[PDB]
Structure 1
Amino acid sequence: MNPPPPETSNPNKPKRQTNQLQYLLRVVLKTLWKHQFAWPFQQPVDAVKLNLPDYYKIIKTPMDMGTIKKRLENNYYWNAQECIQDFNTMFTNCYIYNKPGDDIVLMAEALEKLFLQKINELPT
């Protein structure tokens, strides 16, 4: 059984648009999205489809790039740091659920390096 995916809107949460959040959508996310190793991370983990019945028994803060993209499109975030924390939750989830050297981990590691390169300099 999959849990509900993370919210992409919340009327109790204030919205904001900043130059950095625009960049995180237009440049950072949409470039990572095209990476050859992006596809496992483009949607919430479907534990039923992927036969990972222990995934949500281990991962209690799920995050994926599909959710992040929708949050950026919704102006769900207050600032760029909030969005960056979601990326880091996504990468760390993969490292927590899996082991060093796993194919999926090698994929997340390559994406994390590209992500770090892209956020090294943000607009002002």
Structure 2
Amino acid sequence: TNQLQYLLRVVLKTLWKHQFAWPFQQPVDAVKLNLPDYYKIIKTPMDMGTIKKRLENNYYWNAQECIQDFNTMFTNCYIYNKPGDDIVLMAEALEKLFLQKINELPT
């Protein structure tokens, strides 16, 4: 019933497994991909890699701080990219699944 435990062992596990996870398993390396304007446009970057770490290393005060970061990851992608881009359809897919798993969240 500890919610952070649930986010790690169940929510993050399911999303990490998913077909479309791989572009979100690590920070967007703006240099390698030649994105000069990314860290200017996106104020608080986020990826499942960093969320994973933060859950493992007892960083989050509570589950709501963690769920905020997941949402930042999605909105970040929807901000920087054009709608109907492939990257977006992938984040949208992940988000749907994320919100299903958050509804079975133990109280």
TM-score (norm 2): 0.96
Deviation at 1:121, TM superposition (A): 1.7
The superposition leaves residues 77-104 of structure 1 with CA deviations (integer Å, 9 ceiling, x where unpaired) of 1111110000000000000001110000
Inter-partner Cα distance in structure 1 for 2:72 and 2:92: 13
SS at match of 1:37: coil
Matched, 1:48 2:48: no
Deviation at 1:57, TM superposition (A): 1.6
**Among the aligned pairs, what percent are the same residue?**
100
Deviation at 1:64, TM superposition (A): 0.8
User: Which structure 2 residue ranges, 5 or more long, are not aligned?
Assistant: none
Deviation at 1:23, TM superposition (A): 0.4
Deviation at 1:75, TM superposition (A): 1.2
User: Which structure 1 residue ranges, 5 or more long, are not aligned?
Assistant: 1-17
Any runs of at least 4 consecutive aligned residues in structure 1 with deviations exceeding 6 A, and if so which? none
The superposition leaves residues 26-79 of structure 1 with CA deviations (integer Å, 9 ceiling, x where unpaired) of 000011001110001011110011222211121011111100000000111111
Inter-partner Cα distance in structure 1 for 2:27 and 2:65: 19
Q: Tell which structure's C-alpha radius of gyration is larger.
A: 1
Inter-partner Cα distance in structure 1 for 2:13 and 2:31: 27
In angstroms, what is the RMSD of aligned CA positions? 1.0
Deviation at 1:114, TM superposition (A): 0.4
The superposition leaves residues 1-47 of structure 1 with CA deviations (integer Å, 9 ceiling, x where unpaired) of xxxxxxxxxxxxxxxxx710000000000110011100010111100
Deviation at 1:123, TM superposition (A): 1.4
Inter-partner Cα distance in structure 2 for 1:117 and 1:55: 30
Aligned residue pairs, count: 107
